[PDB]
Design a protein around this ligand. Structure first.
Ligand code: ZN
Ligand code: ZN
Ligand code: ZN
Ligand code: ZN
Ligand code: ZN
Ligand code: ZN
Ligand code: ZN
Ligand code: ZN
Ligand code: ZN
Ligand code: ZN
Lengths: 361, 361, 361, 361, 361
């Protein structure tokens, strides 16, 4: 079997790096399109445009509607066409970054991804996704991912905790794919590079995660925050894409089978619970499971069905989640041979294990 | 300080993957130019062309002159222009792959790199180099690095040993840059991703290196050979480019200050000795140094001045090597504060340490 | 001395395996007799009969009176004779399974044992037992032990805790027989196979026991519950029969010398206390003893005389228990050289040690 | 998935236990048939008959032709029919024991298996097998396996070394099935009981194997020999049947695709090499592989192609072995996803690894 | 069971302590009898008498005949009677010290034991023994054991090696009695004091034994020699008497069943082989056994049948040794349940294990 590793061309992370944007685009082009929603234009959008102007780089300001639909992409791509911009700059959260990637594919443009929170590991990836249907690949991983830690230190602590949750799934999922001989999102078995990256991701989070969370609460940049932002973005990104997905993200996707307040949680908050479910489907001792539960609690992340807005959910409701999670083509099959009923049982088990832990402290 | 990580867009490694070349180029183009020297055209060049024809992909066969000069690049680029090929495929050793990268930059073409030996970590890099003058960056890291382990299992054992030598410098050099707060070739401080990759590189080589060497001697592909080819290519490549260079490659470059039979050694063989010199400049116990010497000997690699064709070299000759190695702009300054005289002393020390080891077994 | 190992011919465990009963009996016979009490006929008895009918297997439904007496066996054996059934299927708890084994011996019939709780390690054994008089062997160990974890996940949590208690005695007792050169129930010294099984039994219970207990409380099947059901049934069964019994089960038997509410406790609940008594008769540190007490408490099992309904029992009452436990022929002599008075003292010591632990938390 | 564990009903091992044969058959029957070949009748056959006569047990003496064919079984079964014997006693090596099992299935007779060497783990199993075609199950595992260590201490040392070789494959193969989620010969996933048994098997052999080999050379029974005979018979038997087979026995079977002197080696000698091939297909360091090679050499077992009478074998010959080993239905697929070409490469690698070790000592 | 510990009243060890003899006897008496053979009178006998005269202590010089018979004791006791001596001083080797103890019992005299070699652990004991018949206890352990290390440093190295051999049996034998619940020579189970003493004995010998052996070869007193003399005398003495005897000394006694050159070996030399036999009867790995063999060889002690003058001994001869060793009342039954045949096998096994070790170095 062939091993495959893919990656964005360049990843740059540091305090105030947003100010050198004109610098990194020098020998690339002098015309760009900048995509952000209303809030983000105030947070970083104008700062970016102003930095590009200083360097004589034109910039068409686009206000993202807030929905990553084909129409919005078509609308934005037209604007870029007319402005004849060769560089797409997406700034902000998930939906904006995905839209920007779709836009860049239409135009065959150089794409710069500028996250304003380290909340998911979508930034460096070549893939995207009310009910989940499938994963789709873009033509490439992003050309430049620019991560400004000063910006992230000012984003809500809840968003850093969410990114830690999403990154904590990386080693759990990749390890299960490596052990089962399964395939990664990249198409082949995992490389040793991805295994090393994924395992280091977990180590970095257990070591610095709480200190990074406190740093954000005080809105300061520290070595601990720099370490966790890299884990949440570069390690988690490469780890999941080239290391492999399994049950945790399948459960996250399964939640789309339900309607309700659960959908106000972040991707990371849902993945935290999904990760506990994967651990309940594996052979771990009580102490190994509690090591994760303890960390989630110290980051104010959800660990019970009640925490994810599914208090007293019925077996039938959980079964819908399980059926969606075990749909043909889901990632859970890359590491497990389970039925929807096994998965439904594991969801209730994880809830019971977390409650048992809580009723001990 | 900003951390920077760069990487080729896609790395694919496996037995007989050369046969799926038309498959990986499908949604990219139908016209290519293939670059290889006379020997390599027989080894893999024709197989590639034949695989491209089956998929209706045109291919201009170019015979590399054997010298990576501006003229040769200009000559090859013209041919590609006329054929109006959008994909450059370079097959073979170092000089051919570098030339192919230069060609792809002229044409702004998609580039595929196909090494026929896992002898250096140049394949995945965005950089190139009778006396060494400086490093120069290409506009990008390669789009696709395709590594066929069946081909490498048939290449000379000496070439695998050379690649292991070059890869064994990765952790030594990167660790010294990380400890000193120095910068990598990529421009910033090392990421945690590169540190993880570099350290895993060394572990993989001590674990599987000899088994991989025996596999090649028997011309068979095994899990051990697959592990070492990845270490020699993807881990060593990312590790040195994004992890950092230091004294070992500076010494390799310093040898160009001399004329002689030493220049028939491979890049890896020279780096092996360069690595011992770096260890002699650091604070290690005798046992730590011997751990490397032992491995080099079991791979038939050079460990003494006599082994690198500099038997009884004079202090003045070694001083020339040291002066070149400590030239302004060399990588040794990223991790050390040493003079040419300190380096000359370390070269003789490494030789003495290796002899002392040999005169013990 | 000869080593002897005995075992049921086949052990099958899994979720919903009760549904493949007709499948496992295919090449055996087409006529059976099913034995269960009133409650169990509703729990699993009818499901089994219905599964046998689908496969054209006749089944005489027998309602167990609830008492494992010679008359009941004779009564059931007659029915089987008349129906001329060649397979006996016993479903339910201890008394029913023993009766079914006795029935199968009368008829020389193939016997299937289907426990509805994993509460004791009697299922796989070839032996049986108001005052205890002696152990008696059946002509064989059961032909097929079929353990459906979905059924056990729905049985009371108290019954799983009881089975864990009975299984926690396995390594304690077998280790003492191995160390003393004593004989097992199977007739010779223990094999290495039994030692391995017994020791793994304890490890499995400390690792997964609490998670399995929580799984049952939520009525779900998990890897942890699957592990503990095997420990409680196959490992504990082989471990005690072919590994050896010692003081713990001797104390359990000694309780029959008393009348009272203590006899409403389960076999496992009594063995838990019996196990603490054996530990008090051995040389263990306070920490080693507390490791077991801690686990018993987390499973809501009894650890004091008060817990086993013998609050403020008199020395004379405890002495009766001790005399019965040290009767000629009891298993305590396979590992200890103690008098009834030593055993009476150990019963009070275990109570005092547990109280001391409790008066610390 | 369901876990399944099967086992012979009773295993008895000890010095001179052959003398209590009449004792173990008391409450079973008074008429038997004894099967052995010419040599074995002298070694133990007459001793057994004489022991049965003392207890008034009739015994039809059957001389096994030496070939385990349907005709021989039919011939022997007739004799048993006429003598109307209810017990079949097979004494000797592999072919005799298999024949005896086949005979017992025809007659639905109680079967006693009495090995005269501890050379394979076939004794306790319910299965059998010039080119290998498939495995076939008997209706049951043997009723009684009686292993007399005094007899085995007098059998050739080469036969004990062979049994150690066959038993050393147990943990390697079972561990690979457990890790891959594959199925055992018994039909389901492995139980924890089988994992414990298999792993203890390897430990016992590394600990006592050489001492047991020296014991046999001096023709004496020691604790070390008693431990290894149990490992070679009961642990290896249960471990492979209920723990799982993988690549090692598939390679052993693949050798039947060849004609030649290789077929004078014992089953164990072939499995030793097959085990090295499995280790070459896995990810192990040089030191882990050499730990096994070292032991094989100290037991005078084969480790190279030359040792197994295939010196300078051609790629085409090895490919035939590989194709047979990877046939549809072989056990290698329970733990690996490899092609015949991958397996051919691993055979040459194992040879090269062993030679490399030898050319070091 | 009661635990019992016995000991000589006072043990004094040091360089030149023989010179303070008059000092230790001050408040005891002014008349003594000194017993020694011809050689010892020259070695230390006259020095002692001269030291007693200086202190005005009378001393009847007795020349021991060399045979510890009733007549010799009666002869010596008469002399003491007439001299009306109240103190018996025995100086020299085993037979002399035993005789002196017997003499002191007849007279109810204070007894001083002065060994001139540290070759056995008989000095501090209250017991004694051509075929061995039984152990007999004196009325008391000696009142004063006075060990002069200057004297022992001048005794033959072979005698120190012999004492180390006898002391190396202490922990092996005592540990087996402790594990089996057996009784010591002192009459009850072993105390914790004896277990501590016995285990420290082995540690002291592995740590300092070779250095003490080299010290004696150079005839010098060092801390290492002081440590080993105490181990050989006080630790080994208390350890065997109050810790327990088992198979090793039983084998030593069994040799008396044979006539021949074996009886020129020392007690210690015979115990060394006896110790290897006990290890062969226990469950130890090859490495654990070799740890002792290695030490014996470095002290020039016997490890094979050939070394103990029984080269090519017949099974019948070894069987005589085994029968005597397993006689009713021997110490082997305090820790083992073995037959004479098991012991004969273990004697040949130990020889084979030692040869196997030797044929490795
Ligand atoms: Zn995610
Ligand atoms: Zn809402
Ligand atoms: Zn290099
Ligand atoms: Zn030249
Ligand atoms: Zn029980
Ligand atoms: Zn009541
Ligand atoms: Zn086999
Ligand atoms: Zn032949
Ligand atoms: Zn002694
Ligand atoms: Zn003599």
């Amino acid at each position: 079997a062939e091993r495959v590793f893919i990656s964005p061309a360049k990843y740059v992370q540091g305090k105030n790096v947003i100010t050198k944007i004109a610098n990194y685009l020098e020998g690339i082009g002098n015309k760009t399109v900048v995509i952000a929603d209303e809030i983000v234009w105030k947070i970083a959008g104008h700062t970016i445009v102003n930095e590009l102007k200083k360097g004589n780089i034109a910039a068409e300001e686009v206000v993202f509607s807030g929905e990553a639909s084909r129409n919005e992409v078509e609308r934005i791509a037209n604007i870029a066409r007319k402005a004849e911009a060769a560089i797409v700059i997406g700034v902000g959260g998930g939906k904006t970054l995905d839209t920007a990637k779709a836009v860049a594919d239409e135009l065959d443009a150089y794409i710069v991804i500028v996250p304003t929170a380290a909340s998911t590991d979508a930034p460096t990836s070549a893939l995207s996704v009310g009910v989940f249907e499938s994963y789709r690949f873009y033509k490439k991983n992003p050309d430049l991912v620019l991560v400004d830690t000063k910006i992230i230190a000012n984003a809500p602590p809840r968003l850093l905790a969410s990114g830690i949750a999403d990154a904590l799934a990386t080693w759990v999922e990749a390890r299960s794919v490596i052990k089962s001989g399964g395939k990664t999102m990249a198409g082949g078995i995992p490389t040793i590079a991805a295994e090393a990256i994924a395992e280091k991701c977990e180590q970095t989070l257990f070591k610095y995660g709480k200190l990074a969370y406190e740093s954000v609460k005080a809105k300061v940049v520290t070595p601990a925050l720099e370490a966790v932002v890299e884990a949440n973005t570069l390690l988690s990104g490469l780890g999941f894409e080239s290391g492999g997905l399994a049950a945790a993200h399948a459960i996250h996707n399964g939640f789309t089978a339900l309607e309700g307040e659960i959908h106000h949680l972040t991707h990371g908050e849902k993945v935290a619970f999904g990760t506990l479910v994967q651990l309940a489907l594996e052979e771990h001792s009580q102490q190994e499971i509690e090591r994760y539960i303890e960390l989630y609690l110290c980051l104010d992340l959800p660990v019970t069905l009640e925490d994810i807005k599914l208090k007293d959910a019925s077996r039938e409701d959980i079964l819908k989640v399980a059926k969606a999670a075990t749909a043909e083509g889901e990632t859970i099959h890359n590491a497990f041979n389970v039925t929807a009923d096994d998965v439904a049982d594991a969801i209730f088990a994880a809830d019971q294990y977390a409650k048992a832990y809580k009723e001990k402290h």
